[PDB]
Design an enzyme around this catalytic site. Sequence first.
Site, PDB file in Angstrom:
ATOM      1  N   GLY A  52       0.778  -1.231   0.000  1.00 38.89           N
ATOM      2  CA  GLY A  52       0.000   0.000   0.000  1.00 38.89           C
ATOM      3  C   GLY A  52       0.810   1.282   0.000  1.00 38.89           C
ATOM      4  N   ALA A  53       0.124   2.387   0.324  1.00 40.25           N
ATOM      5  CA  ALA A  53       0.644   3.758   0.277  1.00 40.25           C
ATOM      6  C   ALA A  53       1.942   3.936   1.035  1.00 40.25           C
ATOM      7  CB  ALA A  53      -0.400   4.749   0.799  1.00 40.25           C
ATOM      8  N   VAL A  90       3.330  -6.101   3.029  1.00 44.38           N
ATOM      9  CA  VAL A  90       3.145  -7.265   3.928  1.00 44.38           C
ATOM     10  C   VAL A  90       3.753  -8.475   3.305  1.00 44.38           C
ATOM     11  CG1 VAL A  90       1.472  -8.725   5.197  1.00 44.38           C
ATOM     12  CG2 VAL A  90       1.069  -6.286   4.966  1.00 44.38           C
ATOM     13  N   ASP A 133     -13.216   0.532   9.313  1.00 42.10           N
ATOM     14  CA  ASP A 133     -12.954   0.035   7.977  1.00 42.10           C
ATOM     15  C   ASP A 133     -13.105  -1.476   7.930  1.00 42.10           C
ATOM     16  OD1 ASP A 133     -12.421   0.310   5.288  1.00 42.10           O
ATOM     17  OD2 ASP A 133     -10.271   0.323   5.490  1.00 42.10           O
ATOM     18  N   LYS A 157       4.521  -7.003   8.496  1.00 42.61           N
ATOM     19  CA  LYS A 157       4.245  -5.773   7.756  1.00 42.61           C
ATOM     20  C   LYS A 157       5.349  -4.766   7.995  1.00 42.61           C
ATOM     21  CE  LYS A 157       0.804  -3.091   8.914  1.00 42.61           C
ATOM     22  NZ  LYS A 157      -0.490  -2.375   8.996  1.00 42.61           N
TER      23      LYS A 157
HETATM   24  O1  LIG Z   1      -1.844  -4.800   7.561  1.00 41.05           O
HETATM   25  C1  LIG Z   1      -2.727  -5.184   6.821  1.00 41.05           C
HETATM   26  C2  LIG Z   1      -3.163  -6.576   6.562  1.00 41.05           C
HETATM   27  C3  LIG Z   1      -2.644  -7.785   7.032  1.00 41.05           C
HETATM   28  C4  LIG Z   1      -3.228  -8.994   6.643  1.00 41.05           C
HETATM   29  C5  LIG Z   1      -2.764 -10.318   7.151  1.00 41.05           C
HETATM   30  N1  LIG Z   1      -2.941 -11.329   6.278  1.00 41.05           N
HETATM   31  C6  LIG Z   1      -2.602 -12.568   6.686  1.00 41.05           C
HETATM   32  N2  LIG Z   1      -2.766 -13.582   5.813  1.00 41.05           N
HETATM   33  C7  LIG Z   1      -3.188 -13.454   4.424  1.00 41.05           C
HETATM   34  C8  LIG Z   1      -4.703 -13.375   4.329  1.00 41.05           C
HETATM   35  C9  LIG Z   1      -5.125 -13.403   2.883  1.00 41.05           C
HETATM   36  O2  LIG Z   1      -4.633 -14.573   2.221  1.00 41.05           O
HETATM   37  C10 LIG Z   1      -3.208 -14.576   2.220  1.00 41.05           C
HETATM   38  C11 LIG Z   1      -2.662 -14.629   3.626  1.00 41.05           C
HETATM   39  N3  LIG Z   1      -2.126 -12.913   7.887  1.00 41.05           N
HETATM   40  C12 LIG Z   1      -1.961 -11.905   8.746  1.00 41.05           C
HETATM   41  C13 LIG Z   1      -2.275 -10.595   8.430  1.00 41.05           C
HETATM   42 CL1  LIG Z   1      -2.006  -9.403   9.641  1.00 41.05          CL
HETATM   43  C14 LIG Z   1      -4.371  -8.940   5.823  1.00 41.05           C
HETATM   44  C15 LIG Z   1      -4.889  -7.733   5.372  1.00 41.05           C
HETATM   45  C16 LIG Z   1      -4.282  -6.540   5.743  1.00 41.05           C
HETATM   46  C17 LIG Z   1      -4.607  -5.117   5.406  1.00 41.05           C
HETATM   47  N4  LIG Z   1      -3.521  -4.388   6.066  1.00 41.05           N
HETATM   48  C18 LIG Z   1      -3.382  -2.927   6.026  1.00 41.05           C
HETATM   49  C19 LIG Z   1      -3.262  -2.331   4.622  1.00 41.05           C
HETATM   50  N5  LIG Z   1      -1.984  -2.494   3.904  1.00 41.05           N
HETATM   51  C20 LIG Z   1      -1.718  -3.880   3.505  1.00 41.05           C
HETATM   52  C21 LIG Z   1      -0.489  -3.931   2.635  1.00 41.05           C
HETATM   53  O3  LIG Z   1       0.654  -3.394   3.306  1.00 41.05           O
HETATM   54  C22 LIG Z   1       0.408  -2.052   3.745  1.00 41.05           C
HETATM   55  C23 LIG Z   1      -0.819  -1.963   4.620  1.00 41.05           C
END
Ligand SMILES: O=C1c2cc(-c3nc(NC4CCOCC4)ncc3Cl)ccc2CN1CCN1CCOCC1
EC number: 2.7.11.24
Length: 342
Positions: free
Chosen positions: A27-28, A32, A142, A47
């Site tokens: 993202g911005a 991750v 959100d 992240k």
């Molecule tokens: O921090 C997160 C985040 C973490 C996750 C996350 N996913 C997973 N497993 C995936 C789930 C799907 O299948 C593939 C595996 N496990 C832990 C987390 Cl903690 C999911 C969604 C989000 C949105 N987000 C904020 C927005 N941006 C994201 C990109 O980087 C900059 C910030």
Amino acid sequence: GAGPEMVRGQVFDVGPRYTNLSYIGEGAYGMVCSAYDNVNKVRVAIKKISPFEHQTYCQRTLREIKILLRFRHENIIGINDIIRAPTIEQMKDVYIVQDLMETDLYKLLKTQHLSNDHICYFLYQILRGLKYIHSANVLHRDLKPSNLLLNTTCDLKICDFGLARVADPDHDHTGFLTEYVATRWYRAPEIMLNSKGYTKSIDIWSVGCILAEMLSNRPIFPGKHYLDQLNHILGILGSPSQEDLNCIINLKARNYLLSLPHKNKVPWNRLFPNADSKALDLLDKMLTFNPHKRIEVEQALAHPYLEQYYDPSDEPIAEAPFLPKEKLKELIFEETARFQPG
Ligand SMILES: O=C1c2cc(-c3nc(NC4CCOCC4)ncc3Cl)ccc2CN1CCN1CCOCC1
């Protein structure tokens, strides 16, 4: 004779615990990945966050960390570790380490039909995590399927507290067509009319939209732009009543609504003809146009649709309810100090 792992243009300074990196998304001001933990011996989500050039990214990084380090709840993603440099000067990035989850509800809905039992269970979990969030005087702001993570046994956890705020209902009023930051499809009607999204009712609306989406695998109100979101909502809910109009005191918002041709309610059982009728009665109550009349989280948990799960003694509440980018960088540094060696 080692060095830091690279991903897709970005350095991941996360060793030696955290090896074998796969890209998940970006993202911005961040990206991750997954990685193998070594103290514990499982793969984890990491992240990278690079907010220090911008005021509002510092505000959001700090709020997310302060909230998640305070929160402990089975249906809410926690922070297991935070990696950053030992000095503010050397600190360009922060790495947040979290439980890795298999999938999310966005990916699940685009590929999988949900049985009524899965919908019921997922809704219970969403609401149980949200009972805790609201009980800390925090709004997520959100909630959407991609922020609802699942493991292989259908355990659900809410993530992404990036737009979260401490509730502030006394300062919720704004003008008509005031810009908004949260994902458009899950925005309550009042956002476009007279609300800053600082009451608990804003999250319940999003959960409503999530429930509708679980029932058909398609978003209920997929508006293409700011005001089309309100067009979509009113096309199903129909025209607001006189009573509900009268709570909208800003003239521009009231006269907009008065300007629109009369629309009748689409009944939920026509949109969702294979849905459980109790699921539709709770849906109706979460998607009430008037935020004051909208069901609250604890009242949703006690709804007959959720009776197989409802157990208030096992739906915990929070023990501890709730600047320039250079003073905020220092707060981020303070806030992450406990995960440092020594
Ligand atoms: O921090 C997160 C985040 C973490 C996750 C996350 N996913 C997973 N497993 C995936 C789930 C799907 O299948 C593939 C595996 N496990 C832990 C987390 Cl903690 C999911 C969604 C989000 C949105 N987000 C904020 C927005 N941006 C994201 C990109 O980087 C900059 C910030």
